[PDB]
Amino acid sequence: SHGGTTRGILQIRSDQQQSQHALENFKREWKSSLSGINGSWQIPVVMADDIKFVNMTPTANDMQFEKWLN
Amino acid sequence: KGKIIKGGKRFVQVVDKRVVASFTSRELAMGIRNPRTELSSSGYGLSEVEIAMKEFIAYNNTESFNDRFF
Amino acid sequence: SLYGQQQAYAEPFIEMMDTNPEFRDKRSYMKNEHNLHDVLKKFGNNPILNAIILTRSNQVAMYCQPARYSEKGLGFEVRLRDLDAEPGRKEKEEMKRIEDFIVNTGKDKDVDRDSFQTFCKKIVRDTYIYDQVNFEKVFNKNNKTKLEKFIAVDPSTIFYATDKKGKIIKGGKRFVQVVDKRVVASFTSRELAMGIRNPRTELSSSGYGLSEVEIAMKEFIAYNNTESFNDRFFSHGGTTRGILQIRSDQQQSQHALENFKREWKSSLSGINGSWQIPVVMADDIKFVNMTPTANDMQFEKWLNYLINIISALYGIDPAEIGFPNRGGATQQQSQNKGLQPLLRFIEDLVNRHIISEYGDKYTFQFVGGDTKSATDKLNILKLETQIFKTVNEAREEQGKKPIEGGDIILDASFLQGTAQLQQDKQYNDGKQKERLQMM
């Protein structure tokens, strides 16, 4: 019912922060190629200097404080 | 007046949105296994497929996701 | 026309334009393809499906012998319609003749013709692949009223005939055979049967049955390409273990590499020199792995799931075809849901199509392999008789005549009560002699 459900952040290093128009076109390409069941198994390609993915939540979530409730 | 009829012909057959024939109560039976009292349904039964529609599409697209690897 | 004279419509009001006027085509569920049995014939060769077919055929083949010729009760039998009705020498002979006729599939023996065992083995395949079964009858030419022979015909070539208006016909010839899209012959309803195991009411199918192969088509192709994926590791490349890199300022000439290979093969190849260790004095050496340490089959649980659902569609236990049940056990109940409905379907078809030619008073049924149910029935009777039922009432109830001895209820106590009552009754009734003596 509230936020905090993010899996992680995809960082892309660049000398300049890309203009928002470029990021919107990036999103358009990403959605057209990968979004949904359509193109689910495909792999994108990017030629940036360095890319990282930092995890904000664990691999698999589950209920917390179960024994406390019991 | 739009109200459902009791006397005489009560059930009607429709094909391609055209009325073809109609039947007396004795001439045609009507069995409802999962009846409901709310006015919205007007006596028509509730099918489990409608209840499980979301689950059915989820199963279908899950199977598609598994098969799309091959 | 499809079933008879009726007020409602049970056939498509508007005909399919691309179909030939002479008959109504059989089409897929979604109308995706107007030609279905052609693609089902492709899946007819699948091993899993063929394994199920062969297992069920072997199961049925045991039952396909007459009872009275078998030392044990397993087999089939013909009897009067009423179990309580008495038999007779004439009727017994007629039933024996009919049973022999069914066994030989005709009036007289002929080695060139199918025994009923092979007929059933054909029928199960046609029932489980196409969900449609047909067999031709051969009435006597000297007398149309009576029957001589009957044999099976492939269901793929048979269609429902239609009139000039395109509606399905009832009177006269109703079924038509088509080969290479050409009409060859047509048959009267009595002359050709039509068995549908999985019927449907929607106008789109127009009475044609729904085959499980069409439902499992996606699963079947998934199984096929999964098997191909597993086999392509061997039948195609990608079996390398790794690459042995040797760093050098210059790439060695191919002659040097060939001599290197010669030395390597002479020293290490084969069992000979298997345990030896070579020595190399290069700057740096690496071995990079392209495949894991040990290989094995992939997508195993996917295959188990697919075959489990395919088996569940046909009602067969996956354990019979060498797969694990994803739930339950990981046989009587599996048999009860799997085989018995098929036997009853064949029973009803054969009865209503063959025995109709001889008379209503007879019927055809299978027997045997159901001791436990009969045991429970006898146990019901054995418990009931202790308090409730007399011996003679039960004997009459099961189409038999009473035995002299009284309609006794079997309990050692109850007999003593009747005997004691009779003994004391005779004592009391004996006092009438004294009553008359005073007269």
XYZ file of C-alpha atoms in Angstrom:
579
model
C 0.000 0.000 0.000
C 3.061 2.298 0.225
C 6.322 2.625 -1.656
C 9.621 0.835 -1.253
C 8.938 -1.975 -3.748
C 11.843 -1.114 -6.066
C 14.185 -3.939 -7.046
C 17.222 -1.797 -7.840
C 18.695 1.105 -9.779
C 20.419 0.868 -13.169
C 23.277 3.380 -13.220
C 24.903 4.437 -16.496
C 28.065 6.529 -16.273
C 28.478 9.473 -18.633
C 30.450 12.707 -18.739
C 27.187 14.635 -19.219
C 23.732 13.795 -17.922
C 21.676 12.911 -20.986
C 18.921 15.338 -21.920
C 15.419 14.281 -20.922
C 14.391 13.964 -24.579
C 17.126 11.376 -25.112
C 16.021 9.493 -21.996
C 12.426 9.501 -23.244
C 13.524 8.035 -26.580
C 15.608 5.506 -24.635
C 12.456 4.528 -22.737
C 10.498 4.284 -25.989
C 13.035 1.873 -27.471
C 13.201 -0.147 -24.247
C 9.417 -0.469 -24.013
C 9.023 -1.333 -27.694
C 11.700 -4.039 -27.576
C 11.429 -5.596 -24.097
C 8.174 -4.653 -22.349
C 5.638 -7.336 -21.524
C 5.531 -10.919 -22.705
C 6.452 -9.606 -26.151
C 10.236 -9.658 -26.417
C 10.480 -10.959 -22.856
C 13.546 -13.172 -23.384
C 15.484 -10.668 -25.501
C 18.744 -9.018 -24.437
C 19.435 -5.293 -25.028
C 22.825 -3.842 -25.939
C 24.346 -0.591 -24.661
C 27.768 0.884 -25.464
C 28.296 3.192 -22.492
C 31.543 3.496 -20.547
C 30.378 1.596 -17.455
C 27.075 0.199 -16.179
C 26.081 -0.956 -12.698
C 22.975 -2.414 -11.084
C 22.683 -1.771 -7.341
C 20.139 -3.807 -5.391
C 17.832 -1.999 -2.967
C 15.798 -5.063 -1.915
C 16.793 -8.729 -1.536
C 16.452 -11.397 -4.209
C 13.114 -12.672 -2.866
C 10.721 -11.034 -0.415
C 8.492 -12.682 2.176
C 6.493 -11.918 5.299
C 8.415 -10.429 8.224
C 8.077 -11.001 11.974
C 6.219 -14.277 11.462
C 7.250 -15.858 14.767
C 6.363 -12.629 16.584
C 2.811 -12.868 15.231
C 2.572 -16.542 16.186
C -42.560 -2.899 -21.173
C -39.238 -4.771 -20.972
C -40.224 -6.954 -18.015
C -39.603 -10.695 -18.176
C -42.672 -12.667 -19.257
C -44.326 -15.525 -17.365
C -47.275 -16.642 -19.482
C -46.867 -18.220 -22.880
C -43.510 -18.089 -24.617
C -40.803 -17.193 -22.097
C -37.466 -18.330 -23.573
C -36.061 -17.066 -26.878
C -33.203 -18.225 -29.110
C -30.933 -15.608 -30.710
C -28.367 -16.216 -33.464
C -26.106 -13.428 -34.764
C -28.181 -10.902 -32.789
C -31.382 -11.942 -34.614
C -34.429 -13.511 -32.982
C -35.103 -16.907 -34.573
C -37.557 -18.791 -32.349
C -39.151 -18.715 -28.907
C -40.450 -21.422 -26.602
C -43.020 -22.043 -23.893
C -41.811 -22.871 -20.385
C -42.874 -26.515 -20.686
C -41.272 -26.755 -24.138
C -37.817 -25.626 -22.955
C -36.092 -26.154 -19.609
C -33.674 -23.835 -17.809
C -31.205 -25.219 -15.271
C -29.166 -22.832 -13.111
C -26.554 -24.424 -10.847
C -25.098 -21.255 -9.259
C -28.040 -18.868 -8.836
C -27.935 -15.389 -7.341
C -30.504 -13.075 -5.774
C -29.168 -9.667 -6.833
C -31.274 -7.765 -9.345
C -28.267 -7.141 -11.606
C -28.013 -10.762 -12.761
C -31.809 -11.110 -13.137
C -31.663 -14.819 -12.329
C -28.834 -15.784 -14.680
C -26.278 -18.078 -13.101
C -22.701 -17.152 -12.257
C -20.020 -19.171 -14.042
C -16.723 -20.028 -12.369
C -14.847 -19.085 -15.558
C -15.768 -15.427 -15.060
C -14.506 -15.590 -11.472
C -11.219 -17.229 -12.528
C -10.753 -15.072 -15.647
C -7.725 -13.247 -14.233
C -6.219 -16.529 -13.041
C -6.836 -18.144 -16.434
C -5.083 -15.365 -18.354
C -2.237 -15.443 -15.823
C -1.838 -19.184 -16.385
C -1.924 -18.717 -20.161
C 0.721 -15.995 -20.250
C 2.882 -17.868 -17.719
C 2.845 -20.889 -20.031
C 3.658 -18.585 -22.946
C 6.566 -17.110 -20.978
C 7.954 -20.574 -20.265
C 7.559 -21.675 -23.898
C 9.076 -18.512 -25.391
C 12.552 -19.604 -24.286
C 12.339 -22.236 -27.038
C -32.541 -32.366 -39.643
C -29.329 -32.883 -37.676
C -31.123 -34.758 -34.875
C -34.723 -34.655 -36.098
C -37.696 -32.344 -36.377
C -37.377 -29.669 -33.698
C -38.313 -26.064 -33.002
C -34.836 -24.782 -32.097
C -31.694 -24.386 -34.196
C -28.773 -26.717 -33.440
C -26.797 -26.129 -36.662
C -25.161 -22.985 -38.097
C -27.802 -20.742 -39.636
C -25.329 -19.428 -42.240
C -23.079 -21.930 -43.989
C -19.314 -21.583 -44.224
C -18.732 -20.093 -47.664
C -15.446 -21.820 -48.516
C -16.817 -25.314 -47.807
C -18.052 -27.537 -50.611
C -21.867 -27.699 -50.935
C -21.925 -31.500 -50.804
C -20.788 -31.779 -47.168
C -20.050 -29.784 -44.024
C -16.369 -29.537 -43.142
C -14.920 -30.211 -39.696
C -12.917 -27.274 -38.356
C -10.833 -26.197 -35.386
C -12.360 -24.832 -32.191
C -11.485 -21.188 -32.897
C -12.102 -21.505 -36.669
C -8.377 -20.817 -37.109
C -8.131 -23.656 -39.653
C -10.942 -25.226 -41.674
C -8.861 -28.427 -42.069
C -8.045 -30.191 -38.793
C -7.523 -33.928 -39.228
C -4.633 -33.184 -41.601
C -2.653 -31.540 -38.796
C -3.830 -34.110 -36.235
C -2.402 -36.825 -38.493
C 1.002 -35.201 -37.957
C 0.731 -35.571 -34.173
C -0.542 -39.128 -34.670
C 3.108 -40.267 -34.728
C 4.131 -38.785 -31.366
C 5.688 -41.348 -28.960
C 3.928 -40.199 -25.781
C 0.556 -40.263 -27.527
C 1.378 -43.581 -29.191
C 2.489 -44.960 -25.823
C -0.884 -44.044 -24.307
C -2.698 -45.546 -27.304
C -0.763 -48.805 -27.098
C -1.180 -49.136 -23.326
C -4.941 -48.607 -23.573
C -5.166 -50.989 -26.539
C -3.328 -53.700 -24.604
C -5.657 -53.123 -21.652
C -8.737 -53.492 -23.863
C -7.413 -56.533 -25.746
C -7.667 -58.773 -22.670
C -11.423 -58.217 -22.333
C -12.058 -58.997 -26.019
C -13.033 -62.655 -25.728
C -16.393 -64.332 -25.061
C -17.142 -65.314 -21.484
C -18.586 -68.799 -21.988
C -15.461 -69.910 -23.896
C -13.184 -68.577 -21.119
C -12.438 -70.642 -18.022
C -12.424 -67.419 -15.976
C -15.081 -64.730 -16.001
C -13.034 -62.164 -17.930
C -14.562 -61.486 -21.329
C -17.806 -60.275 -22.868
C -21.284 -61.776 -22.863
C -24.697 -61.436 -24.500
C -27.810 -61.866 -22.368
C -31.512 -61.105 -22.306
C -32.403 -57.496 -21.562
C -34.118 -58.443 -18.282
C -31.867 -60.271 -15.825
C -34.905 -61.753 -14.054
C -36.252 -63.226 -17.304
C -35.670 -66.938 -17.781
C -33.485 -68.222 -20.648
C -34.448 -70.809 -23.251
C -32.915 -73.352 -25.582
C -33.881 -71.314 -28.652
C -32.749 -67.992 -27.180
C -29.545 -69.528 -25.811
C -28.662 -70.835 -29.276
C -29.465 -67.459 -30.843
C -27.263 -65.639 -28.327
C -24.433 -68.119 -28.911
C -24.731 -67.535 -32.660
C -24.665 -63.760 -32.160
C -21.593 -64.013 -29.923
C -19.790 -66.122 -32.530
C -20.842 -63.604 -35.189
C -19.307 -60.754 -33.192
C -16.147 -62.785 -32.538
C -15.703 -63.495 -36.258
C -17.078 -60.057 -37.282
C -19.356 -61.699 -39.821
C -21.719 -64.526 -40.598
C -18.914 -66.941 -41.552
C -15.237 -67.303 -40.713
C -12.778 -65.445 -42.938
C -9.040 -65.214 -42.289
C -8.887 -62.095 -44.481
C -11.145 -60.161 -42.073
C -10.507 -58.590 -38.689
C -11.118 -60.384 -35.440
C -12.962 -58.299 -32.866
C -9.704 -57.869 -30.928
C -8.067 -55.989 -33.799
C -11.310 -54.078 -34.371
C -11.240 -52.801 -30.785
C -7.535 -51.997 -31.113
C -8.370 -49.874 -34.163
C -11.328 -48.270 -32.390
C -9.306 -47.132 -29.373
C -6.753 -45.440 -31.638
C -9.469 -43.721 -33.670
C -11.232 -42.693 -30.447
C -8.186 -41.183 -28.752
C -6.581 -39.516 -31.796
C -9.533 -38.128 -33.766
C -12.364 -38.518 -31.210
C -14.411 -39.984 -34.073
C -15.116 -43.636 -34.917
C -16.904 -45.139 -37.917
C -17.526 -48.678 -39.151
C -19.387 -49.846 -42.247
C -22.107 -52.498 -42.287
C -22.702 -54.964 -45.129
C -26.353 -55.991 -45.296
C -27.327 -59.118 -47.202
C -28.103 -58.287 -50.823
C -30.707 -61.051 -51.081
C -32.393 -59.550 -47.992
C -31.761 -55.912 -47.066
C -33.407 -56.502 -43.676
C -30.492 -58.528 -42.264
C -26.754 -58.148 -41.736
C -23.742 -60.102 -43.009
C -20.502 -58.265 -42.166
C -19.224 -55.123 -40.482
C -15.772 -53.524 -40.650
C -14.024 -50.328 -39.613
C -13.502 -47.259 -41.800
C -11.046 -44.440 -41.184
C -12.792 -41.398 -39.631
C -10.600 -38.817 -41.388
C -12.255 -39.476 -44.762
C -15.872 -39.363 -43.502
C -17.975 -36.196 -43.275
C -21.566 -35.147 -42.694
C -23.442 -34.794 -45.971
C -25.540 -31.729 -46.777
C -28.505 -30.946 -49.006
C -28.702 -28.432 -51.849
C -29.476 -25.763 -49.233
C -26.341 -26.775 -47.302
C -28.200 -28.160 -44.283
C -27.258 -31.576 -42.925
C -29.505 -34.362 -44.216
C -31.514 -36.823 -42.122
C -33.325 -39.085 -44.577
C -31.518 -41.463 -46.876
C -27.776 -41.158 -47.325
C -26.324 -39.035 -44.520
C -22.594 -39.842 -44.309
C -20.141 -39.332 -47.175
C -16.560 -40.478 -47.778
C -14.076 -38.031 -49.328
C -10.610 -38.873 -50.677
C -8.264 -36.181 -52.025
C -11.137 -33.672 -51.858
C -13.298 -35.829 -54.168
C -16.596 -37.446 -53.211
C -16.327 -41.220 -53.659
C -19.280 -42.838 -51.877
C -22.071 -42.095 -49.416
C -23.924 -44.223 -46.893
C -27.275 -44.543 -45.161
C -27.437 -44.052 -41.394
C -27.998 -47.763 -40.754
C -25.183 -48.661 -43.164
C -22.550 -46.555 -41.364
C -22.199 -45.724 -37.670
C -20.856 -42.539 -36.086
C -19.440 -42.591 -32.558
C -18.589 -39.315 -30.807
C -16.920 -39.612 -27.400
C -16.450 -35.890 -26.616
C -19.517 -34.138 -28.051
C -20.280 -30.431 -27.907
C -23.434 -28.339 -28.189
C -22.082 -25.187 -29.848
C -23.216 -24.570 -33.412
C -19.635 -24.026 -34.606
C -18.660 -27.694 -34.284
C -21.980 -28.906 -35.761
C -21.848 -32.108 -33.722
C -18.266 -33.114 -34.507
C -16.329 -34.277 -31.477
C -13.436 -32.433 -29.862
C -10.119 -34.290 -29.835
C -7.655 -33.930 -26.972
C -4.786 -33.590 -29.469
C -6.127 -30.215 -30.602
C -6.325 -29.068 -26.978
C -2.761 -30.233 -26.240
C -1.318 -29.027 -29.566
C 0.777 -26.290 -27.945
C 1.978 -28.704 -25.264
C 2.842 -31.324 -27.888
C 4.960 -28.925 -29.946
C 6.617 -27.681 -26.750
C 7.508 -31.259 -25.817
C 8.836 -31.936 -29.319
C 11.078 -28.876 -29.454
C 12.253 -29.450 -25.867
C 13.353 -32.952 -26.863
C 15.026 -31.478 -29.945
C 16.827 -28.933 -27.757
C 18.118 -31.679 -25.473
C 19.236 -33.844 -28.410
C 20.942 -31.010 -30.305
C 23.807 -30.998 -27.799
C 24.882 -34.300 -29.375
C 23.479 -34.029 -32.903
C 24.900 -30.479 -33.184
C 27.963 -28.696 -31.874
C 28.633 -26.991 -28.573
C 30.129 -30.013 -26.779
C 33.531 -28.409 -26.145
C 34.884 -28.540 -22.598
C 37.185 -25.526 -22.845
C 40.010 -23.775 -24.662
C 43.716 -24.072 -23.821
C 45.338 -20.681 -24.415
C 49.118 -20.339 -24.707
C 50.546 -16.819 -24.761
C 53.329 -16.015 -27.213
C 54.764 -12.935 -28.891
C 54.202 -14.576 -32.296
C 51.499 -17.017 -33.325
C 53.275 -20.314 -33.932
C 53.410 -21.516 -37.522
C 50.920 -24.231 -38.420
C 53.740 -26.729 -39.004
C 54.889 -26.255 -35.410
C 51.325 -26.703 -34.157
C 50.996 -29.906 -36.186
C 54.194 -31.276 -34.642
C 52.862 -30.191 -31.240
C 49.717 -32.219 -31.944
C 51.810 -35.196 -33.052
C 53.763 -35.186 -29.791
C 50.591 -34.714 -27.736
C 48.798 -37.591 -29.466
C 51.804 -39.908 -29.253
C 52.325 -39.258 -25.537
C 48.825 -38.764 -24.084
C 46.097 -39.947 -26.470
C 43.880 -42.853 -25.498
C 44.297 -45.280 -22.637
C 47.988 -45.402 -23.536
C 49.747 -42.732 -21.494
C 46.426 -41.688 -19.975
C 47.767 -40.774 -16.519
C 50.875 -38.958 -17.767
C 51.511 -35.232 -17.327
C 52.948 -33.061 -20.142
C 55.380 -30.189 -19.629
C 55.391 -26.841 -21.447
C 57.743 -23.886 -20.929
C 55.672 -21.032 -22.344
C 55.286 -17.629 -20.706
C 51.715 -18.142 -19.473
C 48.999 -20.764 -19.955
C 45.273 -20.600 -19.225
C 42.322 -22.963 -19.523
C 38.946 -21.240 -19.911
C 35.823 -23.338 -19.394
C 33.015 -23.083 -21.947
C 30.733 -25.715 -20.367
C 30.179 -26.694 -16.720
C 31.997 -29.466 -14.877
C 29.226 -32.023 -15.475
C 26.331 -31.907 -17.928
C 22.823 -33.296 -17.517
C 19.336 -33.048 -18.969
C 17.732 -29.599 -18.955
C 14.127 -28.532 -18.343
C 13.287 -31.814 -16.620
C 10.466 -30.441 -14.466
C 9.016 -28.661 -17.507
C 8.758 -32.004 -19.314
C 7.186 -33.657 -16.270
C 4.590 -30.888 -16.029
C 3.751 -31.078 -19.739
C 3.378 -34.856 -19.775
C 1.379 -34.755 -16.533
C -1.205 -32.357 -17.942
C -1.330 -34.274 -21.238
C -1.945 -37.491 -19.292
C -4.618 -35.796 -17.187
C -6.416 -34.741 -20.367
C -6.691 -38.385 -21.454
C -7.366 -39.539 -17.882
C -4.358 -41.891 -17.826
C -2.087 -42.117 -14.801
C 1.357 -40.649 -15.657
C 3.023 -43.448 -13.672
C 2.030 -45.948 -16.373
C 4.041 -44.098 -19.040
C 7.215 -43.802 -16.947
C 6.788 -40.310 -15.494
C 6.325 -39.125 -11.902
C 3.028 -37.814 -10.608
C 3.652 -34.222 -9.536
C 1.114 -34.903 -6.777
C -0.332 -37.848 -4.895
C 1.604 -41.112 -4.907
C 5.087 -39.585 -5.251
C -4.123 -48.432 -9.419
C -7.775 -49.467 -9.149
C -8.999 -45.866 -8.940
C -6.830 -44.851 -11.900
C -8.228 -47.787 -13.879
C -11.776 -46.941 -12.777
C -11.604 -43.442 -14.277
C -9.389 -44.346 -17.239
C -10.501 -47.643 -18.760
C -14.076 -48.337 -17.645
C -15.630 -45.277 -19.385
C -13.946 -46.343 -22.631
C -15.250 -49.893 -22.252
C -18.757 -48.585 -21.570
C -18.549 -46.324 -24.630
C -17.564 -49.242 -26.865
C -20.276 -51.321 -25.181
C -23.029 -48.792 -25.882
C -21.889 -48.220 -29.467
C -21.653 -51.920 -30.335
C -24.949 -52.663 -28.586
C -27.093 -49.937 -30.122
C -25.628 -50.427 -33.617
C -25.278 -54.228 -33.936
C -27.841 -55.771 -31.583
C -30.532 -53.457 -32.979
C -30.462 -55.596 -36.133
C -31.440 -58.773 -34.229
C -33.886 -57.583 -31.568
C -34.577 -55.385 -28.551
C -34.692 -58.285 -26.074
C -30.901 -58.831 -26.199
C -27.958 -56.738 -25.040
C -24.159 -56.828 -25.140
C -21.979 -56.195 -22.093
C -18.484 -56.846 -20.771
C -17.794 -58.867 -17.626
C -14.937 -59.651 -15.261
C -12.075 -57.868 -13.572
C -14.375 -56.367 -10.913
C -14.207 -58.860 -8.047
C -13.955 -56.184 -5.347
C -17.245 -54.519 -6.315
C -18.993 -57.895 -6.469
C -17.383 -58.747 -3.129
C -18.832 -55.585 -1.578
C -22.233 -56.375 -3.111
C -22.159 -59.866 -1.607
C -21.071 -58.338 1.709
C -24.065 -55.987 1.598
C -26.325 -58.995 1.094
C -24.560 -61.022 3.799
C -24.978 -58.239 6.358
C -28.569 -57.520 5.319
C -29.738 -61.128 5.613
C -28.701 -61.393 9.277
C -31.595 -59.185 10.434
C -33.607 -58.006 7.438
C -33.970 -60.318 4.451
C -35.187 -63.893 4.183
C -33.241 -66.350 2.046
C -36.153 -66.868 -0.345
C -36.814 -63.136 -0.716
C -33.195 -62.545 -1.761
C -33.221 -65.549 -4.095
C -36.380 -64.211 -5.743
C -34.839 -60.728 -5.842
C -31.898 -61.996 -7.923
C -33.831 -63.832 -10.636
C -33.987 -67.266 -8.995
C -36.721 -69.510 -7.596
C -37.136 -70.276 -3.875
C -35.831 -73.337 -2.050
C -38.143 -75.323 0.205
C -37.352 -74.908 3.889
C -39.214 -71.718 4.782
C -38.428 -68.048 4.211
C -35.951 -68.116 7.075
C -33.796 -65.211 8.233
C -30.338 -66.656 8.859
C -29.436 -66.356 12.526
C -28.962 -69.298 14.878
C -31.024 -67.500 17.524
C -33.964 -66.730 15.222
C -34.389 -70.385 14.254
C -34.603 -71.413 17.910
C -37.352 -68.835 18.402
C -39.409 -70.246 15.542
C -38.691 -73.807 16.678
C -39.538 -72.965 20.290
C -42.684 -71.133 19.183
C -43.695 -74.092 17.015
C -42.873 -76.575 19.787
C -44.932 -74.640 22.335
C -47.599 -73.981 19.696
C -48.010 -77.729 19.182
C -48.231 -78.145 22.958
C -50.996 -75.538 23.181
C -52.747 -76.792 20.038
C -52.601 -80.292 21.521
C -54.915 -79.126 24.312
C -57.768 -78.906 21.796
C -57.812 -82.701 22.091
C -58.589 -82.289 25.792
C -61.119 -79.570 24.944
C -62.997 -82.000 22.694
C -62.510 -84.864 25.169
C -64.868 -83.281 27.708
C -67.551 -83.119 24.992
